[PDB]
Design a binder for this molecule. Structure first.
Ligand SMILES: [Mg+2]
Ligand SMILES: [Mg+2]
Lengths: 193, 193
């Protein structure tokens, strides 16, 4: 299924997920962005996207890459390590969160719209290949939109220019939906007839 | 020299530093806190405290532990890795910043007063022993006060209770001053006649 012009209303929907049909190749550098909106003020732990490999099916404890959080925190997973920062994100407003991984330098950065909020150093490492990307997956407390993944480092000034990822693009017919109906919203940030 | 009842006015003083006379032992877990106040609104890169070992005298690029920042960021150094977070700290107000290192779990946390702002995961590792602790060292753009280091993990609720570190304590006669005159200020948070 293509998600062009559509968002994913995950709020309250515990047995729902969306997954990318294509496995993802080995990436030394990449940028991954998603748009999200929280539809409740005080939430529990949540996941927006996760990249799951065989590492995870052992005890369900190790995620190669993911964006998660709680009511006061954003949480990044990298190769089983976690990095958590305090956030004050408003509910009922769309936010764009982008992650940059420079596997050559071993640098992981998190942005809110054009502004960097976290830079972490870890082992230089590529992205482990052939995992599966999951969205929303208890369920994300709101809506998700416009996931993109590029095999290179985007500059801040490009994050909001409504580009399509060259590895994963929302608009492509690459998505598997489980018990969720994507919905059209012509007010969405990058919507174009 | 003892720093009891005194602060260190480093603002604008480029060739000044304070160092701890005692070398620090190997620590598997520790808490380190300092009070700081910025005396200019828009600042450049600064360091509040650093723990320097022989790793650093090679090209002056690797710091085993340090707290640094710029006008919009707080920066933690651990064994040469950096972790940077966006901050919005007000000038002309005292802030208490505490770091917790759990070398058993490989967990490094940063707090502003009682509130956690960063949790990072890294290699489980102890603190490298016998380095030298430096304060202020171009110079820190304001004043520093009440550095403490304990060989155990303090809970949030204790950070502001004006305890003395059991490894390093501000009030002990353990400090070497270079070209700075510590100043008494009876309004300081933990001052007691
Ligand atoms: Mg396009
Ligand atoms: Mg005392």
């Amino acid at each position: 299924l293509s998600l062009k012009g559509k968002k994913l209303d995950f709020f309250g929907r515990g047995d729902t997920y969306v997954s990318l049909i294509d496995t993802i190749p080995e990436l030394s550098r990449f940028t991954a962005c998603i748009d999200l909106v929280f539809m409740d003020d005080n939430s529990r732990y949540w996941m927006a996207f996760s990249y799951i490999t065989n590492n995870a099916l052992l005890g369900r404890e190790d995620i190669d890459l993911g964006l998660a959080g709680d009511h006061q925190q954003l949480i990044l997973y990298r190769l089983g390590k976690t990095f958590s920062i305090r956030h004050h994100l408003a509910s009922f407003q769309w936010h764009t969160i982008c992650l940059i991984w420079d596997g050559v330098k071993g640098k992981l950065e998190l942005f809110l719209n054009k502004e960097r909020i976290l830079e972490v150093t870890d082992q230089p490492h590529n992205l482990t290949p052939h995992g599966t990307l999951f969205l929303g997956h208890r369920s994300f407390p709101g809506s998700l939109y416009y996931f993109q993944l590029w095999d290179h480092i985007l500059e801040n000034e490009e994050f909001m220019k409504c580009l399509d990822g060259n590895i994963v693009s929302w608009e492509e017919d690459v998505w598997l939906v489980n018990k969720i109906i994507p919905t059209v919203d012509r007010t969405l940030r990058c919507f174009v007839p």
